[PDB]
Write a protein that binds this ligand. Structure first.
Ligand SMILES: [Fe+2]
Length: 287
């Protein structure tokens, strides 16, 4: 029945976000990465392996967001303009996921790349965090869904895009901020420019539906949000310990994770959970 009519606004922001999403369009071929080989080779074995691991985890999350997250969230939306922006955002998640293969092809050998993906595949923490987020999406695999089911999928999507990536983004930023792997750092920043607006946008949509829930549903959903935040946080602390102890950065990354959880909460129109904390300055420089 209904066709998208962009000459009549369905809300006050999808247009702005549409324009911004397309004005930020990019693909991996615009950033040559071969000059990062020079600094790559000067990384210790522990640093190389951490970089590869985090990029692997990043690639998984984008794989989920583009192939489950955006499609299952947008499919049910009655707002056809908003739905359009989210479709475009999904495509961009794939461009992101592919970017990381572009980085890998200059850095690593065939066999090394196989190893990265075998590792990401068999990883219990990555499996656990991706499955938690993704079960909210997969709840929407039925003909009709409630506002509350849709709201929690949106919470889960903002937690992925504004929060769960950042344990991974820490390290390429942290290397780039020191003039190391700067071309790959450039790509990661393009990805961040995108993820930043994705988190805002789906949070705006979440806040709209939140205002349409009953008082009772509002509190079920808030209790759920806090449990979900903290279920994810526990896994992130384990993740950060596994990945970063070898290179002595665990507590720096944890501060960064907490900071980005807070931003996720903010995007949802919610109050911070962790103490305000200064972010590592060399990652600020990498940004
Ligand atoms: Fe992404």
């Amino acid at each position: 029945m209904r066709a998208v009519n962009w000459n009549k606004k369905e809300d006050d922001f999808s247009l702005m976000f549409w324009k911004q999403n397309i004005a930020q369009f990019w693909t991996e071929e615009e950033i040559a990465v071969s000059s990062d080989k020079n600094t790559w080779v000067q990384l210790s074995k522990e640093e190389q392996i951490a970089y590869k691991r985090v990029l692997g985890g990043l690639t998984l999350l984008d794989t989920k967001q583009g192939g489950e997250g955006m499609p299952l969230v947008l499919v049910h939306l009655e707002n056809l303009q908003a739905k359009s922006v989210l479709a475009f955002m999904g495509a961009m998640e794939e461009v992101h996921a592919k970017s990381y293969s572009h980085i890998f092809t200059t850095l690593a050998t065939e066999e090394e790349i196989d190893d990265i993906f075998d590792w990401v595949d068999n990883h219990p923490l990555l499996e656990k965090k991706a499955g938690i987020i993704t079960s909210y999406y997969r709840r929407l695999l039925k003909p009709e869904v409630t506002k509350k089911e849709l709201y929690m999928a949106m919470v889960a999507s903002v937690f992925l895009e504004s929060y769960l990536f950042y344990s991974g983004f820490f390290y390429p930023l942290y290397l780039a901020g020191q003039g190391k792997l700067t071309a790959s750092g450039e790509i990661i920043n393009l990805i961040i420019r995108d993820e930043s607006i994705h988190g805002v946008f789906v949070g705006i949509l979440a806040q709209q539906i939140f205002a349409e829930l009953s008082a009772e549903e509002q509190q079920e959903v808030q209790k759920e949000t806090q449990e979900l935040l903290m279920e994810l946080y526990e896994i992130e602390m384990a993740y950060t310990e596994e990945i970063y102890t070898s290179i002595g950065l665990v507590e720096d990354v944890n501060r960064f994770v907490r900071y980005n959880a807070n931003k996720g909460l903010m995007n949802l129109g919610l109050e911070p959970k962790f103490e305000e904390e200064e972010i590592n300055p060399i990652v600020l420089n990498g940004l």
